[PDB]
Nucleic acid binder design. Structure first.
Length: 156
DNA sequence: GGAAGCGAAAGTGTCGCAACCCGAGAGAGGAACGATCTCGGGTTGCGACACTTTCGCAACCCTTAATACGTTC
């Protein structure tokens, strides 16, 4: 069963238990408000411990392509490298993205899978439903089709 | 995404005011009958404004978080 089999192998848990856990998994988030530095609050949704472990095992199991221009969440690279890339230069064009993490839906993730220029792990159609449960957060309880990436999750 | 309150924005009805019309009437002149100006309703058009509808700001944070110290998203 591909993905669930690998997750069971890594997490030392039965396939049936992991499959049963990944049914209401997108709802398994605890959301809290962290203070902003000047004023206001920031809403962060953090998954439960079991879902966190599942996400960590999944991201360790499957390696997705990343670019060398990305300096965030990369091993050995951080703030200093990002700043030093433009240390010797004169003009700059700092830009931002509009609600970046919450704008990544399962449709976007699956679309980017199929048109990638680099190697992409092969996903069976049976596990494509489980991938969405593993990765994405479901912020409204009544709406089940609204799935977005949540900052504060290990896989995001 | 969107409680509960509330207010913006836009559309629609309404209602009072002005403007005019039309019949009644006392009676100017000058020798009678009724000119002419006013009283009392009545109708219509119009525009300011009240009323009506829709939208949008943004509580809470869901059962489900972790808690050596600092930046960053």
């Amino acid at each position: 069963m591909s993905v669930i089999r690998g997750l069971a192998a890594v997490l030392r848990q039965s396939d049936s238990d992991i499959s049963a856990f990944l049914v209401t998994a997108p709802r398994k988030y605890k959301v809290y408000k962290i203070p902003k530095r000047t004023t206001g609050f920031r809403v962060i949704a953090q998954p439960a411990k079991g879902l966190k472990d599942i996400q960590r095992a999944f991201v360790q199991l499957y390696s997705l392509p990343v670019h060398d221009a990305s300096m965030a969440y990369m091993k050995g690279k951080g703030i200093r490298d990002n700043a030093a890339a433009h240390a010797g230069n004169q003009y700059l064009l700092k830009a931002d993205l509009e609600d970046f993490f919450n704008s990544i839906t399962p449709a976007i993730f699956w679309r980017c899978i199929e048109m990638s220029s680099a190697q992409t792990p092969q996903f069976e159609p049976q596990d494509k439903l489980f991938i969405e449960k593993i990765l994405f957060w479901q912020p409204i309880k009544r709406r089940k089709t609204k799935l977005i990436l949540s900052v504060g999750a290990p896989s995001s």
